């Protein structure tokens, strides 16, 4: 088979960039607009993101028990869940000082990654293959909640994609 290293390198570059943008945008926002008491109330109350229908392992042992195709499929559904909702972070990202943060630029990144994950599942050919991507609901807590969920979901994708890379590519992580 044609070597997969180039595709994994390119898919990982975009996943890391989405993860970095989500983390830095959440941090800036929280530091500027959210006093510590509103933070505690927000974080004490049970962050059930619109993507909670997609089953996402959250510790090392459970994640590594999943197959390559399951981890790519979950990544695919997380990315697709943000294609429409990301336009609701338009004002967040325009007011941001993070270089590269705009909903257009983020939308472009997600679409590019969704097609790369689909090519990777083709090369490596259960409810998770049956279900579809998640749908989002209907101001500053609404933006904070959204940013919280975007950070989380991009975090998952970057991790799940790295795991598949390390197991599928020759000497990618420890040569």
């Amino acid at each position: 088979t044609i070597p997969l290293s180039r595709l994994f390198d390119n898919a990982m570059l975009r996943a890391h960039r989405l993860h970095q943008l989500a983390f830095d945008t959440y941090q800036e926002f929280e530091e500027a607009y959210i006093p510590k008491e509103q933070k505690y109330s927000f974080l004490q109350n049970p962050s059930l993101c619109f993507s909670e229908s997609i089953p996402t392992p959250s510790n090392r042992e459970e994640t590594q028990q999943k197959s390559n195709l399951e981890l790519l499929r979950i990544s695919l559904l997380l990315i697709q869940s943000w294609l429409e909702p990301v336009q609701f972070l338009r004002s967040v990202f325009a007011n941001s000082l993070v270089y590269g943060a705009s909903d257009s630029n983020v939308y472009d990144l997600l679409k590019d990654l969704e097609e790369r994950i689909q090519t990777l599942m083709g090369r490596l050919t259960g409810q998770i293959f049956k279900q579809t991507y998640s749908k989002f609901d209907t101001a500053l807590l609404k933006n904070y909640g959204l940013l919280y969920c975007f950070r989380r979901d991009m975090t998952y994708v970057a991790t799940y994609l790295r795991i598949v890379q390390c197991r599928s590519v020759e000497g990618s992580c420890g040569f």
């Binding site: 180039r6 390198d9 390119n10 990982m12 570059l13 590019d112």
Partner: peptide, 13 residues
């Protein structure tokens, strides 16, 4: 003699 060549293709976006 030289080793076999190694090709370098960097990711880009």
């Amino acid at each position: 003699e030289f080793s076999e060549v190694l090709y370098v293709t960097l990711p880009q976006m």
